[PDB]
mmCIF file of N, CA and C and ligand atoms in Angstrom:
data_model
loop_
_atom_site.group_PDB
_atom_site.id
_atom_site.type_symbol
_atom_site.label_atom_id
_atom_site.label_comp_id
_atom_site.label_asym_id
_atom_site.label_seq_id
_atom_site.Cartn_x
_atom_site.Cartn_y
_atom_site.Cartn_z
ATOM 1 N N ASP A 7 -28.717 -14.468 -11.060
ATOM 2 C CA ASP A 7 -27.536 -15.020 -11.217
ATOM 3 C C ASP A 7 -26.467 -14.125 -11.219
ATOM 4 N N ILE A 8 -25.640 -13.866 -10.097
ATOM 5 C CA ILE A 8 -24.553 -13.027 -9.710
ATOM 6 C C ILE A 8 -23.648 -12.706 -10.887
ATOM 7 N N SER A 9 -23.375 -11.328 -11.248
ATOM 8 C CA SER A 9 -22.460 -10.999 -12.248
ATOM 9 C C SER A 9 -21.230 -10.721 -11.770
ATOM 10 N N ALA A 10 -20.254 -10.628 -12.501
ATOM 11 C CA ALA A 10 -18.824 -10.240 -12.124
ATOM 12 C C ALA A 10 -18.633 -8.826 -11.091
ATOM 13 N N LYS A 11 -19.579 -7.979 -11.613
ATOM 14 C CA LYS A 11 -19.352 -6.663 -11.023
ATOM 15 C C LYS A 11 -20.069 -6.737 -9.382
ATOM 16 N N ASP A 12 -20.987 -7.373 -9.290
ATOM 17 C CA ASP A 12 -21.718 -7.868 -8.036
ATOM 18 C C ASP A 12 -20.929 -8.616 -7.301
ATOM 19 N N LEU A 13 -20.116 -9.727 -7.791
ATOM 20 C CA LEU A 13 -19.281 -10.394 -6.913
ATOM 21 C C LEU A 13 -18.277 -9.712 -6.579
ATOM 22 N N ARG A 14 -17.591 -8.599 -7.399
ATOM 23 C CA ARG A 14 -16.462 -7.902 -7.088
ATOM 24 C C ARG A 14 -16.810 -6.876 -5.797
ATOM 25 N N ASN A 15 -18.229 -6.431 -5.826
ATOM 26 C CA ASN A 15 -18.536 -5.605 -4.739
ATOM 27 C C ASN A 15 -18.667 -6.250 -3.619
ATOM 28 N N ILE A 16 -19.275 -7.281 -3.713
ATOM 29 C CA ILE A 16 -19.261 -8.053 -2.354
ATOM 30 C C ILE A 16 -18.135 -8.292 -1.694
ATOM 31 N N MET A 17 -17.137 -8.708 -2.431
ATOM 32 C CA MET A 17 -15.910 -8.974 -1.887
ATOM 33 C C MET A 17 -15.151 -7.572 -1.569
ATOM 34 N N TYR A 18 -15.274 -6.744 -2.482
ATOM 35 C CA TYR A 18 -14.697 -5.110 -2.126
ATOM 36 C C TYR A 18 -15.275 -4.822 -0.493
ATOM 37 N N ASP A 19 -16.476 -5.114 -0.450
ATOM 38 C CA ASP A 19 -17.347 -4.813 0.631
ATOM 39 C C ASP A 19 -16.544 -5.358 2.078
ATOM 40 N N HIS A 20 -15.971 -6.638 1.769
ATOM 41 C CA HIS A 20 -15.259 -7.211 3.080
ATOM 42 C C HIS A 20 -13.698 -6.833 3.189
ATOM 43 N N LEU A 21 -13.275 -5.907 2.331
ATOM 44 C CA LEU A 21 -12.010 -5.723 2.636
ATOM 45 C C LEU A 21 -11.648 -4.337 3.090
ATOM 46 N N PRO A 22 -10.652 -4.040 3.896
ATOM 47 C CA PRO A 22 -10.322 -2.898 4.405
ATOM 48 C C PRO A 22 -9.229 -2.080 3.518
ATOM 49 N N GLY A 23 -9.388 -0.866 3.378
ATOM 50 C CA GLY A 23 -8.639 0.045 2.455
ATOM 51 C C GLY A 23 -9.183 0.151 1.200
ATOM 52 N N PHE A 24 -8.385 0.928 0.199
ATOM 53 C CA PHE A 24 -8.786 0.694 -1.174
ATOM 54 C C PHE A 24 -7.706 0.560 -2.035
ATOM 55 N N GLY A 25 -7.807 -0.097 -3.190
ATOM 56 C CA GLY A 25 -6.719 -0.569 -4.112
ATOM 57 C C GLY A 25 -5.486 -1.146 -3.611
ATOM 58 N N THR A 26 -5.737 -2.273 -2.703
ATOM 59 C CA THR A 26 -4.711 -2.903 -2.098
ATOM 60 C C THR A 26 -4.452 -4.294 -3.016
ATOM 61 N N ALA A 27 -3.114 -5.170 -2.775
ATOM 62 C CA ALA A 27 -3.054 -5.960 -3.630
ATOM 63 C C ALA A 27 -4.324 -7.185 -3.485
ATOM 64 N N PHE A 28 -5.111 -7.089 -2.666
ATOM 65 C CA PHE A 28 -6.299 -7.980 -2.325
ATOM 66 C C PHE A 28 -7.487 -7.665 -3.127
ATOM 67 N N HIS A 29 -7.450 -6.331 -3.577
ATOM 68 C CA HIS A 29 -8.339 -5.657 -4.243
ATOM 69 C C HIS A 29 -8.011 -6.012 -5.795
ATOM 70 N N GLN A 30 -7.155 -6.104 -6.116
ATOM 71 C CA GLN A 30 -6.550 -6.518 -7.369
ATOM 72 C C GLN A 30 -7.011 -8.181 -7.576
ATOM 73 N N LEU A 31 -6.493 -8.825 -6.327
ATOM 74 C CA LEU A 31 -6.847 -10.302 -6.560
ATOM 75 C C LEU A 31 -8.370 -10.576 -6.824
ATOM 76 N N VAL A 32 -9.207 -9.727 -5.970
ATOM 77 C CA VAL A 32 -10.667 -9.646 -6.521
ATOM 78 C C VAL A 32 -10.964 -9.488 -7.869
ATOM 79 N N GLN A 33 -10.292 -8.474 -8.505
ATOM 80 C CA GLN A 33 -10.444 -7.965 -9.893
ATOM 81 C C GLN A 33 -10.029 -9.410 -10.733
ATOM 82 N N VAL A 34 -9.050 -9.999 -10.494
ATOM 83 C CA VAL A 34 -8.658 -11.290 -11.207
ATOM 84 C C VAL A 34 -9.470 -12.357 -11.027
ATOM 85 N N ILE A 35 -9.859 -12.592 -9.771
ATOM 86 C CA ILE A 35 -10.780 -13.888 -9.574
ATOM 87 C C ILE A 35 -12.123 -13.592 -10.238
ATOM 88 N N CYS A 36 -12.759 -12.636 -10.661
ATOM 89 C CA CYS A 36 -13.648 -12.080 -11.202
ATOM 90 C C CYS A 36 -13.750 -12.364 -12.619
ATOM 91 N N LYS A 37 -12.641 -11.661 -13.092
ATOM 92 C CA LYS A 37 -12.553 -11.658 -14.591
ATOM 93 C C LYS A 37 -12.086 -13.394 -15.041
ATOM 94 N N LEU A 38 -11.022 -13.874 -14.284
ATOM 95 C CA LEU A 38 -10.853 -15.369 -14.794
ATOM 96 C C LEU A 38 -12.061 -16.233 -14.552
ATOM 97 N N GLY A 39 -12.920 -15.767 -13.277
ATOM 98 C CA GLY A 39 -13.995 -16.518 -13.112
ATOM 99 C C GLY A 39 -15.201 -16.286 -14.084
ATOM 100 N N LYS A 40 -15.381 -15.131 -14.468
ATOM 101 C CA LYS A 40 -16.494 -14.871 -15.619
ATOM 102 C C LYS A 40 -15.853 -15.653 -16.758
ATOM 103 N N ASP A 41 -14.795 -15.580 -17.159
ATOM 104 C CA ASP A 41 -14.384 -16.161 -18.401
ATOM 105 C C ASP A 41 -14.836 -17.732 -18.243
ATOM 106 N N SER A 42 -14.729 -18.326 -17.333
ATOM 107 C CA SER A 42 -14.908 -19.774 -17.126
ATOM 108 C C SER A 42 -16.033 -20.105 -16.336
ATOM 109 N N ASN A 43 -17.190 -19.112 -16.429
ATOM 110 C CA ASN A 43 -18.404 -19.451 -15.714
ATOM 111 C C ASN A 43 -18.514 -20.135 -14.387
ATOM 112 N N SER A 44 -17.625 -19.405 -13.605
ATOM 113 C CA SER A 44 -17.134 -19.971 -12.169
ATOM 114 C C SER A 44 -17.509 -19.110 -11.120
ATOM 115 N N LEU A 45 -18.158 -18.056 -11.647
ATOM 116 C CA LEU A 45 -18.648 -17.112 -10.505
ATOM 117 C C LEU A 45 -19.417 -17.596 -9.313
ATOM 118 N N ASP A 46 -20.543 -18.486 -9.710
ATOM 119 C CA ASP A 46 -21.198 -19.207 -8.516
ATOM 120 C C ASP A 46 -20.478 -20.054 -7.925
ATOM 121 N N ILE A 47 -19.547 -20.898 -8.067
ATOM 122 C CA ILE A 47 -18.692 -21.557 -7.292
ATOM 123 C C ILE A 47 -17.783 -20.747 -6.503
ATOM 124 N N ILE A 48 -17.243 -19.797 -7.029
ATOM 125 C CA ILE A 48 -16.303 -18.870 -6.628
ATOM 126 C C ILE A 48 -16.910 -18.083 -5.256
ATOM 127 N N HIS A 49 -18.214 -17.657 -5.449
ATOM 128 C CA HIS A 49 -19.108 -16.830 -4.630
ATOM 129 C C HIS A 49 -19.362 -17.490 -3.504
ATOM 130 N N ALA A 50 -19.648 -19.033 -3.512
ATOM 131 C CA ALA A 50 -20.126 -20.015 -2.648
ATOM 132 C C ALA A 50 -18.987 -20.428 -1.599
ATOM 133 N N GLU A 51 -17.659 -20.522 -2.285
ATOM 134 C CA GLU A 51 -16.631 -20.964 -1.569
ATOM 135 C C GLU A 51 -16.019 -19.635 -0.735
ATOM 136 N N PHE A 52 -16.184 -18.658 -1.326
ATOM 137 C CA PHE A 52 -15.860 -17.269 -0.497
ATOM 138 C C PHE A 52 -16.656 -17.227 0.431
ATOM 139 N N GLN A 53 -18.220 -17.424 0.479
ATOM 140 C CA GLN A 53 -18.999 -17.331 1.590
ATOM 141 C C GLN A 53 -18.899 -18.466 2.646
ATOM 142 N N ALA A 54 -18.522 -19.675 2.156
ATOM 143 C CA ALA A 54 -18.245 -20.831 3.024
ATOM 144 C C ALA A 54 -17.024 -20.677 4.093
ATOM 145 N N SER A 55 -15.824 -19.911 3.419
ATOM 146 C CA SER A 55 -14.688 -19.565 4.123
ATOM 147 C C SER A 55 -15.229 -18.870 5.049
ATOM 148 N N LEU A 56 -15.924 -17.565 4.959
ATOM 149 C CA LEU A 56 -16.518 -16.475 5.843
ATOM 150 C C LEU A 56 -16.960 -17.214 7.050
ATOM 151 N N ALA A 57 -17.893 -18.123 6.665
ATOM 152 C CA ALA A 57 -18.731 -18.920 7.499
ATOM 153 C C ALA A 57 -18.167 -19.798 8.774
ATOM 154 N N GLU A 58 -16.796 -20.072 8.206
ATOM 155 C CA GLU A 58 -15.899 -21.036 8.825
ATOM 156 C C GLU A 58 -15.050 -20.166 9.822
ATOM 157 N N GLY A 59 -15.160 -18.636 9.505
ATOM 158 C CA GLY A 59 -14.390 -17.961 10.513
ATOM 159 C C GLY A 59 -13.061 -17.478 9.855
ATOM 160 N N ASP A 60 -12.817 -17.627 8.706
ATOM 161 C CA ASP A 60 -12.059 -17.155 8.040
ATOM 162 C C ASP A 60 -11.734 -15.707 7.587
ATOM 163 N N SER A 61 -10.702 -14.972 7.762
ATOM 164 C CA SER A 61 -10.709 -13.592 7.149
ATOM 165 C C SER A 61 -10.951 -13.410 5.818
ATOM 166 N N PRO A 62 -11.575 -12.463 5.298
ATOM 167 C CA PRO A 62 -11.569 -12.160 3.878
ATOM 168 C C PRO A 62 -10.360 -12.176 2.934
ATOM 169 N N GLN A 63 -9.647 -11.979 3.812
ATOM 170 C CA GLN A 63 -8.179 -12.171 2.613
ATOM 171 C C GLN A 63 -7.735 -13.637 2.661
ATOM 172 N N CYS A 64 -7.689 -14.201 3.796
ATOM 173 C CA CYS A 64 -7.667 -15.835 3.798
ATOM 174 C C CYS A 64 -8.596 -16.283 3.070
ATOM 175 N N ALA A 65 -9.940 -16.078 3.096
ATOM 176 C CA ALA A 65 -10.966 -16.419 1.774
ATOM 177 C C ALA A 65 -10.629 -16.545 0.434
ATOM 178 N N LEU A 66 -10.166 -15.143 0.199
ATOM 179 C CA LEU A 66 -9.783 -15.039 -1.249
ATOM 180 C C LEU A 66 -8.545 -15.853 -1.533
ATOM 181 N N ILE A 67 -7.603 -16.204 -0.898
ATOM 182 C CA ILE A 67 -6.349 -17.080 -0.987
ATOM 183 C C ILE A 67 -7.164 -18.767 -1.273
ATOM 184 N N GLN A 68 -7.972 -18.999 -0.361
ATOM 185 C CA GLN A 68 -8.453 -20.202 -0.527
ATOM 186 C C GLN A 68 -9.212 -20.553 -1.725
ATOM 187 N N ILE A 69 -9.844 -19.622 -2.041
ATOM 188 C CA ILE A 69 -10.361 -19.664 -3.656
ATOM 189 C C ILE A 69 -9.218 -20.058 -4.533
ATOM 190 N N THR A 70 -8.168 -19.342 -4.504
ATOM 191 C CA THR A 70 -7.049 -19.735 -5.493
ATOM 192 C C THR A 70 -6.722 -20.985 -5.701
ATOM 193 N N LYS A 71 -6.793 -21.408 -4.143
ATOM 194 C CA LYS A 71 -6.406 -22.998 -4.002
ATOM 195 C C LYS A 71 -7.330 -24.061 -4.192
ATOM 196 N N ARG A 72 -8.470 -23.674 -3.978
ATOM 197 C CA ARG A 72 -9.355 -24.753 -3.868
ATOM 198 C C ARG A 72 -10.447 -24.710 -5.291
ATOM 199 N N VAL A 73 -10.547 -23.546 -5.970
ATOM 200 C CA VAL A 73 -11.344 -23.460 -7.329
ATOM 201 C C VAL A 73 -10.625 -23.950 -8.297
ATOM 202 N N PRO A 74 -10.863 -24.965 -9.062
ATOM 203 C CA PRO A 74 -9.940 -25.627 -10.198
ATOM 204 C C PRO A 74 -9.633 -24.925 -11.153
ATOM 205 N N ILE A 75 -10.346 -23.765 -11.518
ATOM 206 C CA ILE A 75 -9.544 -22.843 -12.787
ATOM 207 C C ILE A 75 -8.317 -21.866 -12.160
ATOM 208 N N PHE A 76 -8.108 -21.984 -10.861
ATOM 209 C CA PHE A 76 -6.724 -21.318 -10.523
ATOM 210 C C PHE A 76 -5.786 -22.323 -10.189
ATOM 211 N N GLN A 77 -5.864 -23.163 -9.935
ATOM 212 C CA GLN A 77 -4.726 -24.343 -9.622
ATOM 213 C C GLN A 77 -3.954 -24.618 -10.737
ATOM 214 N N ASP A 78 -2.503 -24.267 -10.281
ATOM 215 C CA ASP A 78 -1.496 -24.404 -11.218
ATOM 216 C C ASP A 78 -1.851 -23.249 -12.634
ATOM 217 N N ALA A 79 -2.355 -22.335 -12.220
ATOM 218 C CA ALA A 79 -2.670 -21.368 -13.231
ATOM 219 C C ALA A 79 -1.618 -20.343 -13.061
ATOM 220 N N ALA A 80 -1.261 -19.755 -14.415
ATOM 221 C CA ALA A 80 -0.143 -18.805 -14.497
ATOM 222 C C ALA A 80 -0.996 -17.294 -14.140
ATOM 223 N N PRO A 81 -0.429 -15.919 -13.262
ATOM 224 C CA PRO A 81 -1.274 -14.775 -13.368
ATOM 225 C C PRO A 81 -1.608 -14.378 -14.658
ATOM 226 N N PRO A 82 -2.720 -13.647 -14.699
ATOM 227 C CA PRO A 82 -2.807 -12.890 -16.163
ATOM 228 C C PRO A 82 -2.215 -11.856 -16.142
ATOM 229 N N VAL A 83 -1.829 -11.324 -17.404
ATOM 230 C CA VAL A 83 -1.148 -10.393 -17.882
ATOM 231 C C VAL A 83 -1.916 -9.020 -17.988
ATOM 232 N N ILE A 84 -1.447 -7.903 -17.451
ATOM 233 C CA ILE A 84 -2.551 -6.837 -17.902
ATOM 234 C C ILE A 84 -1.488 -5.573 -18.093
ATOM 235 N N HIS A 85 -1.958 -5.125 -19.598
ATOM 236 C CA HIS A 85 -0.940 -4.193 -20.289
ATOM 237 C C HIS A 85 -1.666 -2.607 -19.546
ATOM 238 N N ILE A 86 -0.579 -1.767 -19.107
ATOM 239 C CA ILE A 86 -0.687 -0.681 -18.470
ATOM 240 C C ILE A 86 0.142 0.277 -19.102
ATOM 241 N N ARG A 87 -0.077 1.680 -19.223
ATOM 242 C CA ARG A 87 0.765 2.537 -19.838
ATOM 243 C C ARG A 87 2.125 2.516 -18.838
ATOM 244 N N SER A 88 1.825 3.151 -17.619
ATOM 245 C CA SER A 88 3.044 3.050 -16.762
ATOM 246 C C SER A 88 2.985 2.419 -15.303
ATOM 247 N N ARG A 89 3.848 2.898 -14.536
ATOM 248 C CA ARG A 89 3.599 2.034 -13.110
ATOM 249 C C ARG A 89 2.855 3.015 -12.320
ATOM 250 N N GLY A 90 2.749 4.428 -12.619
ATOM 251 C CA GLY A 90 1.764 5.244 -11.952
ATOM 252 C C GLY A 90 0.036 4.818 -12.158
ATOM 253 N N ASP A 91 0.125 4.000 -12.941
ATOM 254 C CA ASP A 91 -1.442 3.509 -13.370
ATOM 255 C C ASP A 91 -1.829 2.264 -12.379
ATOM 256 N N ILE A 92 -0.744 1.869 -11.652
ATOM 257 C CA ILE A 92 -1.166 1.038 -10.660
ATOM 258 C C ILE A 92 -1.581 1.347 -9.188
ATOM 259 N N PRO A 93 -2.360 1.147 -8.641
ATOM 260 C CA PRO A 93 -2.843 1.732 -7.289
ATOM 261 C C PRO A 93 -1.741 1.785 -6.219
ATOM 262 N N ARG A 94 -1.803 3.042 -5.570
ATOM 263 C CA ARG A 94 -0.771 3.493 -4.581
ATOM 264 C C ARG A 94 -0.452 2.268 -3.748
ATOM 265 N N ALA A 95 -1.714 1.814 -3.005
ATOM 266 C CA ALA A 95 -1.710 0.660 -2.082
ATOM 267 C C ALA A 95 -1.219 -0.521 -2.422
ATOM 268 N N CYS A 96 -0.861 -0.752 -3.909
ATOM 269 C CA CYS A 96 -0.327 -1.829 -4.615
ATOM 270 C C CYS A 96 1.300 -1.812 -4.931
ATOM 271 N N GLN A 97 1.914 -0.574 -4.817
ATOM 272 C CA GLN A 97 3.083 -0.300 -5.256
ATOM 273 C C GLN A 97 4.193 -0.792 -4.552
ATOM 274 N N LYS A 98 4.122 -1.158 -3.066
ATOM 275 C CA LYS A 98 5.286 -1.966 -2.540
ATOM 276 C C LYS A 98 4.904 -3.424 -2.559
ATOM 277 N N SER A 99 3.693 -4.181 -3.091
ATOM 278 C CA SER A 99 3.597 -5.266 -3.360
ATOM 279 C C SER A 99 4.293 -5.827 -5.084
ATOM 280 N N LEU A 100 4.786 -5.060 -5.597
ATOM 281 C CA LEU A 100 5.250 -5.336 -6.892
ATOM 282 C C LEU A 100 6.861 -5.755 -7.160
ATOM 283 N N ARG A 101 6.920 -6.869 -7.757
ATOM 284 C CA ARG A 101 8.374 -7.605 -7.738
ATOM 285 C C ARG A 101 8.446 -7.875 -9.123
ATOM 286 N N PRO A 102 10.072 -8.144 -9.253
ATOM 287 C CA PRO A 102 10.196 -8.764 -10.693
ATOM 288 C C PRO A 102 9.454 -9.982 -10.987
ATOM 289 N N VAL A 103 9.267 -10.246 -12.114
ATOM 290 C CA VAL A 103 8.516 -11.586 -12.253
ATOM 291 C C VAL A 103 9.394 -12.812 -12.209
ATOM 292 N N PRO A 104 9.104 -13.856 -11.647
ATOM 293 C CA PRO A 104 9.980 -15.111 -11.266
ATOM 294 C C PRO A 104 9.854 -15.825 -12.606
ATOM 295 N N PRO A 105 10.921 -16.963 -12.757
ATOM 296 C CA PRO A 105 10.256 -17.938 -13.985
ATOM 297 C C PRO A 105 8.899 -18.554 -14.163
ATOM 298 N N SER A 106 8.594 -18.943 -13.150
ATOM 299 C CA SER A 106 7.196 -19.603 -13.376
ATOM 300 C C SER A 106 6.175 -19.294 -12.054
ATOM 301 N N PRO A 107 5.713 -18.022 -12.394
ATOM 302 C CA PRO A 107 4.556 -17.350 -11.209
ATOM 303 C C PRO A 107 3.279 -18.198 -11.372
ATOM 304 N N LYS A 108 2.800 -18.527 -10.232
ATOM 305 C CA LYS A 108 1.491 -19.027 -10.233
ATOM 306 C C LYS A 108 0.657 -18.380 -9.185
ATOM 307 N N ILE A 109 -0.723 -18.094 -9.639
ATOM 308 C CA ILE A 109 -1.556 -17.595 -8.843
ATOM 309 C C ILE A 109 -1.689 -18.085 -7.537
ATOM 310 N N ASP A 110 -1.397 -19.590 -7.338
ATOM 311 C CA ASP A 110 -1.938 -20.329 -5.795
ATOM 312 C C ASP A 110 -0.596 -20.242 -5.188
ATOM 313 N N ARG A 111 0.466 -19.567 -5.750
ATOM 314 C CA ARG A 111 1.424 -19.373 -4.909
ATOM 315 C C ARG A 111 1.717 -17.739 -4.645
ATOM 316 N N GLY A 112 0.505 -17.013 -4.939
ATOM 317 C CA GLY A 112 0.661 -15.762 -4.403
ATOM 318 C C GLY A 112 0.854 -14.601 -5.669
ATOM 319 N N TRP A 113 1.207 -15.108 -6.826
ATOM 320 C CA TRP A 113 1.258 -13.987 -7.852
ATOM 321 C C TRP A 113 0.050 -13.716 -8.243
ATOM 322 N N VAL A 114 -0.494 -12.472 -8.118
ATOM 323 C CA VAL A 114 -1.893 -12.091 -8.539
ATOM 324 C C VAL A 114 -1.985 -11.974 -9.834
ATOM 325 N N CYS A 115 -1.388 -11.007 -10.274
ATOM 326 C CA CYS A 115 -1.062 -10.664 -11.673
ATOM 327 C C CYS A 115 0.211 -10.038 -12.186
ATOM 328 N N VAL A 116 0.534 -10.048 -13.729
ATOM 329 C CA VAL A 116 1.505 -9.534 -13.987
ATOM 330 C C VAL A 116 1.001 -8.094 -14.869
ATOM 331 N N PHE A 117 1.711 -7.073 -14.339
ATOM 332 C CA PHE A 117 1.469 -5.954 -15.079
ATOM 333 C C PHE A 117 2.708 -5.804 -16.291
ATOM 334 N N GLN A 118 2.408 -5.743 -17.278
ATOM 335 C CA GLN A 118 3.119 -5.246 -18.575
ATOM 336 C C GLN A 118 2.885 -3.663 -18.925
ATOM 337 N N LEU A 119 3.897 -3.217 -18.907
ATOM 338 C CA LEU A 119 4.338 -1.807 -19.139
ATOM 339 C C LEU A 119 4.688 -1.280 -20.407
ATOM 340 N N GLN A 120 4.149 -0.385 -21.009
ATOM 341 C CA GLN A 120 4.571 0.158 -22.395
ATOM 342 C C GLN A 120 5.656 0.035 -22.931
ATOM 343 N N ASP A 121 6.644 0.380 -22.098
ATOM 344 C CA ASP A 121 8.235 0.449 -22.734
ATOM 345 C C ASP A 121 8.815 -1.150 -22.359
ATOM 346 N N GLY A 122 8.049 -2.259 -22.020
ATOM 347 C CA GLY A 122 8.223 -3.762 -22.254
ATOM 348 C C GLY A 122 8.850 -4.022 -20.920
ATOM 349 N N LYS A 123 8.666 -3.026 -19.788
ATOM 350 C CA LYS A 123 8.882 -3.423 -18.277
ATOM 351 C C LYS A 123 7.653 -4.348 -17.803
ATOM 352 N N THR A 124 7.967 -5.464 -17.128
ATOM 353 C CA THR A 124 7.296 -6.378 -16.226
ATOM 354 C C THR A 124 7.304 -6.260 -14.786
ATOM 355 N N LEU A 125 6.142 -6.404 -13.949
ATOM 356 C CA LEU A 125 6.091 -6.104 -12.903
ATOM 357 C C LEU A 125 4.974 -7.123 -12.251
ATOM 358 N N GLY A 126 5.258 -8.226 -11.455
ATOM 359 C CA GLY A 126 4.304 -9.122 -10.738
ATOM 360 C C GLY A 126 3.682 -8.583 -9.437
ATOM 361 N N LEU A 127 2.419 -8.648 -9.231
ATOM 362 C CA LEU A 127 1.740 -8.239 -7.737
ATOM 363 C C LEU A 127 2.041 -9.478 -7.268
ATOM 364 N N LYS A 128 2.406 -9.447 -5.765
ATOM 365 C CA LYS A 128 2.938 -10.567 -4.946
ATOM 366 C C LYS A 128 1.884 -10.429 -3.744
ATOM 367 N N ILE A 129 1.419 -11.547 -3.205
ATOM 368 C CA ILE A 129 0.881 -11.713 -1.797
ATOM 369 C C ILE A 129 1.547 -12.720 -1.058
HETATM 370 O O1 1D5 B 1 -17.098 -7.848 -15.604
HETATM 371 C C1 1D5 B 1 -16.366 -8.697 -16.535
HETATM 372 O O2 1D5 B 1 -17.023 -8.766 -17.774
HETATM 373 C C2 1D5 B 1 -15.110 -9.190 -16.294
HETATM 374 C C3 1D5 B 1 -14.212 -8.053 -16.046
HETATM 375 C C4 1D5 B 1 -13.574 -7.422 -17.302
HETATM 376 C C5 1D5 B 1 -12.621 -6.377 -16.808
HETATM 377 C C6 1D5 B 1 -11.962 -6.193 -15.580
HETATM 378 N N1 1D5 B 1 -11.121 -5.181 -15.273
HETATM 379 C C7 1D5 B 1 -11.001 -4.098 -15.697
HETATM 380 O O3 1D5 B 1 -12.136 -3.450 -16.535
HETATM 381 C C8 1D5 B 1 -10.068 -3.216 -15.161
HETATM 382 O O4 1D5 B 1 -9.554 -2.060 -15.103
HETATM 383 C C9 1D5 B 1 -9.149 -4.451 -14.525
HETATM 384 C C10 1D5 B 1 -8.013 -4.299 -13.346
HETATM 385 O O5 1D5 B 1 -7.846 -5.033 -12.970
HETATM 386 C C11 1D5 B 1 -6.723 -3.666 -13.826
HETATM 387 C C12 1D5 B 1 -6.648 -2.647 -14.963
HETATM 388 C C13 1D5 B 1 -5.608 -1.569 -14.805
HETATM 389 C C14 1D5 B 1 -4.756 -1.732 -13.882
HETATM 390 CL CL1 1D5 B 1 -3.566 -0.702 -13.190
HETATM 391 S S1 1D5 B 1 -5.533 -2.826 -12.545
HETATM 392 C C15 1D5 B 1 -10.077 -5.637 -14.462
HETATM 393 C C16 1D5 B 1 -8.987 -6.664 -15.228
HETATM 394 C C17 1D5 B 1 -8.747 -7.934 -14.828
HETATM 395 C C18 1D5 B 1 -7.985 -8.574 -15.536
HETATM 396 BR BR1 1D5 B 1 -7.327 -10.542 -15.166
HETATM 397 C C19 1D5 B 1 -7.748 -7.843 -16.816
HETATM 398 S S2 1D5 B 1 -8.387 -6.629 -16.615
HETATM 399 C C20 1D5 B 1 -12.484 -6.957 -14.546
HETATM 400 C C21 1D5 B 1 -13.552 -7.893 -14.866
#
C-alpha cells in the first residue's frame, strides 16, 4: 500500500528541477490525497497519463481535473513565517489571491504569512 511519501518521491522522480510550482503541486496532491484515502486512484491516474504519453506536468494537472476530490476544490492554506520560506523556483509563480481560487484552475495552494499577507501559487 503506497504511502504519501512514496507517491511524492515517485512524482518528484518525473519532474525536472527542484522546488518548482509542480513540486509543490505534488506535495498538495499527496497531502489532500492522503486525507481522502485516494493515494491509490491518484497514483493510477498519474501512471495512466504517462502511459498515454502525457508529460508529467500535464499528468499532474489531469489529476486535479479527473480525481473527484480536487474538482471544484479550493486550494489548501499553508501557514509559513515569511516569503523566504517559499522555494526559489516558486517565487515567480506567486500571485495575489483572487476571489475564488480553485485547484483545477491552477491555484496550487495559498501561503498565509505570519504578518497576515497571503499569496497563491499559480500554474
Ligand atoms: O505524508 C503525509 O502524512 C501527508 C503530508 C503531510 C505533510 C506534508 N507537508 C509538509 O510536511 C510540508 O512541509 C509541506 C509543504 O507543502 C510546505 C511547507 C512549507 C512550505 Cl513553504 S511548503 C507539506 C504540506 C502540504 C499541505 Br496541502 C499542507 S503542508 C505533505 C504531506
